[PDB]
Amino acid sequence: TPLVHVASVEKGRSYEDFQKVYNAIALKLREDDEYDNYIGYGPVLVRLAWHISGTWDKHDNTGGSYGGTYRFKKEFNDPSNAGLQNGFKFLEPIHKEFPWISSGDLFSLGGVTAVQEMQGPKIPWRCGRVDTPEDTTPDNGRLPDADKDAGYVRTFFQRLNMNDREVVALMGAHALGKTHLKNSGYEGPWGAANNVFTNEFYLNLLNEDWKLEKNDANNEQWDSKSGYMMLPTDYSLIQDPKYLSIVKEYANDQDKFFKDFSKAFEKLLENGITFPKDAPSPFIFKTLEEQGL
Numbered sequence: 001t002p003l004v005h006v007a008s009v010e011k012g013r014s015y016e017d018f019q020k021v022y023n024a025i026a027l028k029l030r031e032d033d034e035y036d037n038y039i040g041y042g043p044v045l046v047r048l049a050w051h052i053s054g055t056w057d058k059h060d061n062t063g064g065s066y067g068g069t070y071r072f073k074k075e076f077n078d079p080s081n082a083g084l085q086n087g088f089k090f091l092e093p094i095h096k097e098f099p100w101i102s103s104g105d106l107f108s109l110g111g112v113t114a115v116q117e118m119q120g121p122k123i124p125w126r127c128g129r130v131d132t133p134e135d136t137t138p139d140n141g142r143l144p145d146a147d148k149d150a151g152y153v154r155t156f157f158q159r160l161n162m163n164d165r166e167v168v169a170l171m172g173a174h175a176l177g178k179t180h181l182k183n184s185g186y187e188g189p190w191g192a193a194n195n196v197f198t199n200e201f202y203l204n205l206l207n208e209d210w211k212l213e214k215n216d217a218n219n220e221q222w223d224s225k226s227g228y229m230m231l232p233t234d235y236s237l238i239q240d241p242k243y244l245s246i247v248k249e250y251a252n253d254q255d256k257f258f259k260d261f262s263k264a265f266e267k268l269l270e271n272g273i274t275f276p277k278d279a280p281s282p283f284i285f286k287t288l289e290e291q292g293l
């Protein structure tokens with residue numbers, strides 16, 4: 001009924017092989033530091049890994065990270081994917097160096113690497129995604145809109161099998177990077193330390209004096225006098241009572257948030273994938289710093 005996507009390890013590669021891909025991504029992150037006014041590519045990589053995974057539909061098992069479909073024009077040109085071509089171009093040179101890794105494995109590993117190199121938590125990662133044909137490419141319109149409320153958010157995330165806790169944990173990724181008018185019709189960062197992974201998102205949410213205003217794209221965003229912004233969907237996290245108590249927990253405990261994020265992020269990246277019992281356990285990569293590199 002539902003497609004079945006069995007993870008298949010890239011023939012004859014082990015942990016050490018993947019650690020080398022990780023280290024290559026990481027060294028390039030370190031080196032190409034001028035991107036987006038010195039934010040670096042970390043944030044776009046995280047967003048890339050979420051977008052390739054977010055097309056999943058728990059109803060017929062289509063979409064998700066498995067197929068590396070983002071490589072196809074249809075998904076690549078998804079209006080909701082605007083600005084991701086930058087993460088793509090960053091990974092190409094890497095793919096050329098390690099041509100045996102599948103796309104889905106590379107795209108998703110980029111996300112893990114960025115998080116960990118940006119001082120976030122360790123995210124267990126599993127290999128085995130297999131490139132699928134251009135015809136398995138999901139139609140556009142499965143990624144969420146930003147101009148909605150808590151109800152939309154809850155409903156949406158339900159398609160990916162995420163509960164309230166998972167939704168709020170994952171959204172704390174908004175501490176990274178920023179909106180770009182040209183990409184999404186939103187402009188501004190969510191906080192100050194946008195290339196370091198912290199619970200800043202939650203603090204800003206609770207602590208700033210947010211003003212609803214329209215931007216130059218003629219969209220409404222919540223603006224703070226500190227120069228930060230929140231999307232309607234971000235804001236909705238404090239409008240819903242269930243959401244708001246989680247936000248509070250995270251604002252209060254960065255550890256808690258890190259643990260929750262880690263689980264939800266991995267889950268997000270593994271949705272739609274069946275792992276045979278003989279499959280290797282999830283890998284935990286060392287950072288550059290842990291390797292002395």
Ligand code: HEM
Pocket residue numbers: 043044046047050082083144145146147153170171173174176177178179180181182183184185186231233
């Ligand atoms: C309701 C769900 C979400 C909505 C509506 C949303 C919307 C957006 C929008 C409109 C942008 C700005 C794009 C641009 O103009 O460059 C953005 C950026 C970003 N999103 Fe989200 N997002 C959502 C969930 C997530 C999740 C679950 C993650 C990761 C777990 C994530 C990670 C990021 C990151 C890191 C950026 C910054 C990228 C950069 O600086 O290029 N977002 N998101």
